[PDB]
Automatic annotation (TrEMBL), chain A:
One of its GO terms (cellular component) is cytosolic small ribosomal subunit. Belongs to the universal ribosomal protein uS4 family. Transmembrane segments: none annotated. This is Ribosomal protein S9. One of its GO terms (molecular function) is structural constituent of ribosome. GO terms for biological process: ribosomal small subunit biogenesis; translation. The keyword Cytoplasm does not apply.
From TrEMBL, chain C:
It holds the Pfam family Ribosomal_S30. Belongs to the eukaryotic ribosomal protein eS30 family. This is 40S ribosomal protein S30. It comes from the Eukaryota. Residues 1-27 are annotated as: Disordered. GO terms for cellular component: cytosolic small ribosomal subunit. It comes from Giardia intestinalis (strain ATCC 50803 / WB clone C6) (Giardia lamblia). GO terms for biological process: translation. Residues 12-21 have a biased composition (Basic and acidic residues). Keywords: Ribonucleoprotein, Ribosomal protein. InterPro entries: Ribosomal_eS30. One of its GO terms (molecular function) is structural constituent of ribosome.
UniProtKB/TrEMBL annotation, chain D:
Keywords: Ribonucleoprotein, Ribosomal protein. GO terms for biological process: translation. This is Ribosomal protein S24. PANTHER family: 40S RIBOSOMAL PROTEIN S24.
UniProtKB/TrEMBL annotation, chain E:
This is Ribosomal protein S23. GO terms for cellular component: cytosolic small ribosomal subunit; ribosome. It comes from the Eukaryota. GO terms for molecular function: structural constituent of ribosome. One of its GO terms (biological process) is translation. Pfam families: Ribosom_S12_S23. InterPro entries: NA-bd_OB-fold, Ribosomal_uS12, Ribosomal_uS12_euk/arc.
Length: 176, 260, 62, 118, 139
RNA sequence: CAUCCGGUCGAUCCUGCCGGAGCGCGACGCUCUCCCCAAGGACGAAGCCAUGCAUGCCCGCUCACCCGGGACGCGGCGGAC
RNA sequence: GUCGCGGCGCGCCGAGGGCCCGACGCCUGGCGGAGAAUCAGGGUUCGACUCCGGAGAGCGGGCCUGCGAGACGGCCCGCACAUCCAAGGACGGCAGCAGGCGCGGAACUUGCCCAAUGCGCGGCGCGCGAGGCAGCGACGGGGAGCGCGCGAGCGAGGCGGGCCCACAGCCCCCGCCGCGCAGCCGAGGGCAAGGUCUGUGCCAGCAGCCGCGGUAAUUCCAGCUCGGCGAGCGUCGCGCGGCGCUGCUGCAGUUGAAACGCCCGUAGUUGGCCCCCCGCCGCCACGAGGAAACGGGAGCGCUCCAGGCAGGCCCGUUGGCCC
């Protein structure tokens, strides 16, 4: 049988219901320039994550307030969202969870965080920098632009001392 | 078909054993002896998982071949020897001895004991039967068979085994009020006093016992093991079967992970 | 069936025009962004226009 | 370029006379020059008194960072290493040489042929 | 209609079971008479050796001579007439060449002007027919 | 985690199917810069099989030209998993 | 008789037994569940395949051994189907693993090894095509690329050294070099993207459907641009969704398809109002009991992610709980 056969796998993205719709295409392209997104598949993965969360809150909210269930899981969902920075830490209500949008999830992507921190000039520049392993999420080198930073980790993010700046000074173009 | 099965698959193995899904495609096949598969846990699992004294099964066999560990005071070389409730797992070379009890979440737990506590182990008589010329015999949960029991002891009445002379020491009979620890099912791992026993003649005597949280748990006589009279008798785990709820355990988990 | 493929064998052959190789990946979508949204210099002539219009073209080269 | 090597959760194992632990080797902007280089550094905390007695295993180096974690098997005595050791681990260290290549297919072919020859 | 009573489930189950058969779609999918009729015999593709070649006049209004090869499937020795897609691609097909034929696309219905033809050639002599048209591979 | 849209007409409103729009999971074509996980002769042939291989271990009982090697057999246990 | 119970078999005696709440027959390109696909709610279809139970080793049978086999990597017989042969005889059984042929639309190496995970046997480890390790492999799932900037960089590679490994290798870590690289389907609609410029002339073709082409083809065949999706994209067969076109929610029956020509009528289904306070039935709630995986779902930064149960001086660190 083998251990591998036992391993789970998942489709983390939702493809559209109509794939040639004019409104969806326009917003997608506007989002694509905004966050330096590689393919619509990355945008799709964002919609999926929001839909899971929205449904989880929806079910807990249909359950009556103070029903054991909302206490155990609703507190957990809010905690998780506040700790990834998707949700404002003041809101802290399950009803607010429903009113989230994919853009806000995309905002916590490191490439957007690097740009607001300014460690790079553009969202394009942020993607190239994170790829070159220049970025550090805090004592840890990050090569993946997708990385979603936790709200606490944002301050820890800095260009790693070993990199293009403050270093050997001789990699790539400098060597020749 | 044909004869017996000498292999156990990892996902078939009991959940309380907490074996890794990707850890292996096979699990230790527990052997027969004093405890059955549903109500046992292999000796290799205590030494490899909780104790971590032996890195691999091979190391556990080497230690066992040299009689490093003694259960019930006897050095046993069975990696798959079944271990269950009140079994005294004493490893003298490491200098540490503990009993094997039940955690609130139902996994078997190693609870440290003093030298007096190490000497004796509790037992539960399943029933008293007549055989071999009519002599009565009492069969403990640990399958220990004792000829000629004192007449007062009845079915389901906890008794204490010397384990040095291996004889009955005393009997705490099962009755209303006496403190018991559930051994199986949803309430497994919970110590409570007996509020009432429902006769339910025909099948399944169902007993209700309540802990000091005012919460009554209803469990049939099969998995009710008396642990002293009103006194808890033998030392009990630190949680003491007080039934922590899911929300409360959520806070405890978060405090533990607060530490880095 | 003696007339099979009558247009294909007698159609004239026009060579593929050599072109600046287009950017690929996120870089293509990034260059598609200037056209679609912020910028708009290439896609407008006093009003919105289609990407393959004969008026957008000739004004943007081809 | 400094290297800091620490032992965490060491285990007393009189049965196999070993000292199981987890080794955190910190080599920021550096490469530890092999496990033996940090074996002496691990020996300092372990206090075994013989670097050879210490066995080092599973030294995963984290992606990019200088936090590498490796299980440690500093046997308390030499007899333990002599006995309770994966023959291959003993071979990796260089404590013993390896046996000359054997087909194993021949070891099974020999079994098949030796049974047929009654 | 809609008999509804707390204890009337059996009547409703029977009605659904009997009535569901009425749709052509349930019958073609589940009666399975079609499986025996299907030349493809429950396969996406079938391998058959070309036994004949012909030109089928396109159904009016559209007029052309669609190019097709009559092929007997190797699997069941069952006749199939298969359209050759692309422009002048019957030149690629040769009699006795051996072809892989796939459904025309309407699940057993003739597609477009071609009359009563339910199959199309996707491969000739181990080489994809589209690739032959696109000049990816030769003969 | 609630949607439709083309085709009966001179036009129109219906019913009604036809065809599209989504996801699978197999085939087929074309193509493929790296890394991770991962299915793989089930699909009306439970058709036929060349070769090699998948079940041994023990040392009870040693008068087999090293030794107390532990041949070989006898025994034992497994081969029913 | 059996391990035993039983028409299980045999005598003996009766006439039962089953059935529109579908017996019996027949067919099944029928292993069943845990589950899976799709999915507002309800639903539909599949369940060979990972776990559990069943069944079989070409086909029927029959046995022996053992505690347990009607065992086939045991035996014996017929039956097809092989091999050898000095011609008397001998002898198999890959629905075990690799590998071969046939067949089909369709499917991988005659590898390497017990180091783990188990098991058999031993007390100082041996056996294992169970299993692990490599190769093959766009079944698929997941993550980063083909630049950014206007000067600095990376990693794809290449080479050493670690790390890893039964031994390699891969990963990862380092020095030293360092050379980014896109397809596949379309642009009349539905359906996002020229009413371009060629050829051609109801031909050749295209087109799921509407249709297009017969000299000014928005549709073919090509350059041209553009659009979708993306290391993938297109086609075919099917499942599900769409389809309230199967309808319990939730269809329709004057005329679109559809009230039996009528009345009686049993089975079936459905029955007004009434008693409070009990007994059975459903009924609702909450238990207990018994498999995990799976699916949820607590916690945990596998660098992110698909993952996995981790981790870290830790609730007796965890691995809860629901189903």
């Amino acid at each position: 049988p083998r251990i591998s056969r036992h391993r789970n796998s998942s489709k983390t993205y939702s493809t559209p219901k109509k794939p040639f719709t004019k409104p969806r295409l326009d917003a997608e392209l506007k989002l694509c320039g905004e966050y330096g997104l590689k393919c619509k598949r990355e945008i799709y993965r964002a919609r999926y994550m929001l839909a899971k969360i929205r449904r989880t809150a929806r079910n807990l909210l249909t359950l009556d307030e103070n029903d054991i269930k909302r206490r155990f899981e609703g507190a957990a969902l809010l905690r998780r969202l506040h700790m990834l920075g998707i949700l404002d830490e003041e809101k802290d209500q399950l009803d607010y969870v429903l009113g989230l949008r994919i853009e806000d999830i995309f905002k916590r992507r490191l490439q957007s965080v690097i740009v607001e921190s300014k460690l790079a000039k553009s969202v394009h520049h942020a993607r190239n920098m994170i790829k070159a392993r220049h970025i550090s999420v805090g004592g840890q080198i990050v090569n993946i632009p997708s990385y979603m930073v936790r709200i606490s980790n944002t301050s820890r993010v800095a260009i790693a001392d070993t990199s293009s700046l403050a270093p050997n000074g001789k990699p790539g173009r400098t060597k020749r | 078909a044909r004869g017996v099965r000498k292999h156990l698959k990892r996902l078939n193995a009991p959940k309380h054993w907490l074996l890794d899904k990707m850890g292996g495609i096979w699990a230790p096949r527990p052997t027969n002896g004093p405890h059955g598969l549903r109500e046992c846990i292999p000796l290799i699992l205590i030494l490899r998982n909780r104790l971590h004294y032996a890195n691999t099964y091979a190391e556990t066999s080497m230690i066992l071949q040299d009689k490093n560990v003694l259960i019930d005071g006897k050095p046993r070389t069975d990696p798959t020897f079944p271990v269950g409730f009140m079994d005294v797992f004493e490893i003298p070379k490491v200098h540490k001895t503990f009993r094997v009890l039940y955690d609130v979440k139902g996994r078997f737990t190693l609870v440290p004991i003093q030298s007096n506590e190490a000497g004796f182990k509790l037992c539960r008589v399943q029933k008293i039967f007549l055989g071999d010329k009519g002599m009565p015999y009492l069969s403990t949960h640990d399958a220990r068979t004792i000829r000629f029991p004192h007449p007062d002891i009845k079915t389901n009445d906890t008794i204490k085994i010397n384990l040095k002379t291996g004889k009955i020491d005393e009997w705490y009979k099962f009755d209303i009020g006496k403190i018991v620890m559930v051994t199986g099912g949803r309430n497994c791992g919970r110590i409570g006093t007996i509020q009432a026993i429902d006769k339910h003649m025909g099948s399944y005597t169902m007993i209700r016992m309540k802990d000091t949280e005012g919460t009554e748990f209803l469990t049939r006589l099969c998995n009710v093991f008396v642990i002293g009279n009103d006194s808890p008798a033998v030392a009990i785990p630190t949680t003491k079967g007080i039934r922590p709820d899911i929300i409360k355990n959520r806070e405890l988990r978060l405090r533990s992970i607060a530490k880095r | 069936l003696t007339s099979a493929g009558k247009v294909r064998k007698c159609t004239p052959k026009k060579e593929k025009k050599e072109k600046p190789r287009p950017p690929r990946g996120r870089a293509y979508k990034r260059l598609l962004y200037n056209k679609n949204f912020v910028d708009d210099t290439l896609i407008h002539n006093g009003r919105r226009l289609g990407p393959n219009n004969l008026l957008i073209r000739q004004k943007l080269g081809f | 370029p400094e290297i800091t090597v620490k032992v965490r959760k060491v285990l007393n194992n009189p049965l196999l006379q070993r000292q199981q632990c987890v080794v955190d080797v910190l080599h920021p902007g550096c490469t530890y020059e092999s496990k033996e280089a940090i074996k002496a550094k691990v020996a300092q905390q372990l206090k075994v008194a013989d670097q050879k007695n210490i066995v080092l295993y599973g030294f995963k180096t984290s992606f990019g960072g200088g936090h590498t974690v490796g299980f440690c098997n500093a046997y308390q005595n030499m007899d333990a290493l002599m006995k309770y050791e994966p023959g291959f681990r003993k071979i990796r260290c260089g404590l013993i040489e390896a046996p000359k290549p054997v087909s194993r297919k021949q070891l099974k072919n020999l079994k098949n042929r030796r049974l047929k020859k009654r | 209609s809609k008999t509804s009573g707390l204890y009337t489930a059996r009547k409703l189950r029977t009605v659904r079971r009997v009535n569901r058969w009425a749709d052509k779609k349930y019958r073609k999918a589940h009666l399975g008479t079609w499986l025996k009729a299907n030349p493809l015999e429950g396969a996406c593709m079938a391998r058959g050796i070309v036994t004949q070649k012909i030109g089928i006049s396109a159904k009016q209004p559209n007029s052309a001579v669609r190019k097709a090869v009559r092929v007997q499937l190797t699997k069941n020795s069952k006749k199939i007439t298969a359209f050759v897609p692309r422009d002048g691609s019957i030149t690629y097909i040769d009699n006795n060449d051996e072809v892989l034929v796939a459904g025309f696309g309407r699940a057993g219905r003739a597609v477009g002007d071609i009359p009563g033809c339910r199959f199309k050639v996707i491969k000739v002599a181990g080489i994809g027919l589209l690739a032959l048209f696109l000049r990816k591979r030769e003969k």
